[PDB]
Amino acid sequence: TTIQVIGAGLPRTGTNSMKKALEIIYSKPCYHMYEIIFKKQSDISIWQQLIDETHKTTSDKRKIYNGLNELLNGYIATTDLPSCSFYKELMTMYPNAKVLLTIRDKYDWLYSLRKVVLPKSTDPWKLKIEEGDQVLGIDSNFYKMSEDSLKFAFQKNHINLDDDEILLECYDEYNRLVQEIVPPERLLIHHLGDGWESLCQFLNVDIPNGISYPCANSHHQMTQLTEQLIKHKSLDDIIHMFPGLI
Numbered sequence: 083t084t085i086q087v088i089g090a091g092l093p094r095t096g097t098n099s100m101k102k103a104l105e106i107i108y109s110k111p112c113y114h115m116y117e118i119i120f121k122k123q124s125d126i127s128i129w130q131q132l133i134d135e136t137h138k139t140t141s142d143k144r145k146i147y148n149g150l151n152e153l154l155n156g157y158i159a160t161t162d163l164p165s166c167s168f169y170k171e172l173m174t175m176y177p178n179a180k181v182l183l184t185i186r187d188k189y190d191w192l193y194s195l196r197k198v199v200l201p202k203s204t205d206p207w208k209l210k211i212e213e214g215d216q217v218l219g220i221d222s223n224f225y226k227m228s229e230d231s232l233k234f235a236f237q238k239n240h241i242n243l244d245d246d247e248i249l250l251e252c253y254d255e256y257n258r259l260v261q262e263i264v265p266p267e268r269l270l271i272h273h274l275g276d277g278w279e280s281l282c283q284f285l286n287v288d289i290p291n292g293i294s295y296p297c298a299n300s301h302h303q304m305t306q307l308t309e310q311l312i313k314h315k316s317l318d319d320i321i322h323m324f325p326g327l328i
């Protein structure tokens with residue numbers, strides 16, 4: 083098996099639902115940040131090294147391609163950070179893979195981002211996210227990798243991540259650049275709520291019969307997950323409250 087679909091959409095654009103939709107279509111695994119968190123935390127340092135490699139005056143592109151290939155072995159698709167930030171590299175490695183750009187209203191996106199992936203540095207809720215994630219074994223190394231992958235997607239070394247106005251403009255620019263770089267016939271822009279129809283047409287498959295398009299990972303559910311991790315201190319003890327997520 084090899085990469086068939088490259089998900090270029092940013093975090094909080096429906097990437098977990100797209101991951102699930104691609105797993106339904108292909109009956110093979112799709113990579114996502116949740117693969118790292120819930121199945122393979124040893125991947126954190128590997129991603130960090132690949133991102134660090136991009137910051138060298140002379141980066142080793144073959145080291146990056148080889149590292150991506152090893153990370154994605156056994157997967158049919160990629161979505162979410164950190165992989166989305168490498169969509170150009172993945173297009174080169176997998177010239178026959180199609181590209182998906184999941185997208186949504188930028189104000190809704192920013193709101194969701196601040197609730198889940200990138201709270202402002204002095205937002206009290208950041209401390210709660212961190213306390214809940216500690217239950218999962220997630221610590222500062224994960225947050226560094228996540229933030230560095232977002233900065234790499236936005237092509238900025240120094241950026242004030244606490245400035246909403248900057249993030250909104252980075253979002254629009256990132257999505258504009260995907261549409262500029264990817265040949266139209268190789269790209270599907272999938273707006274939140276678009277469902278199976280356009281996706282299945284683009285991938286040359288029928289709409290899965292009787293299977294609805296996935297709809298999980300809302301910020302409401304993430305807030306509940308953080309709170310229940312804090313309260314019970316065990317993922318196993320609470321996972322029955324969160325079907326269809328991990």
Ligand SMILES: Nc1ncnc2c1ncn2[C@@H]1O[C@H](COP(=O)(O)O)[C@@H](OP(=O)(O)O)[C@H]1O
Pocket residue numbers: 092093094095096097098099162190194274275295296297298299300301302
């Ligand atoms: N089928 C669907 N229809 C509408 N929104 C969806 C959806 N699947 C996921 N989403 C939204 O996509 C966001 C999650 O994205 P990701 O999986 O990339 O982190 C959440 O936004 P909200 O946080 O605004 O609820 C979630 O509600």
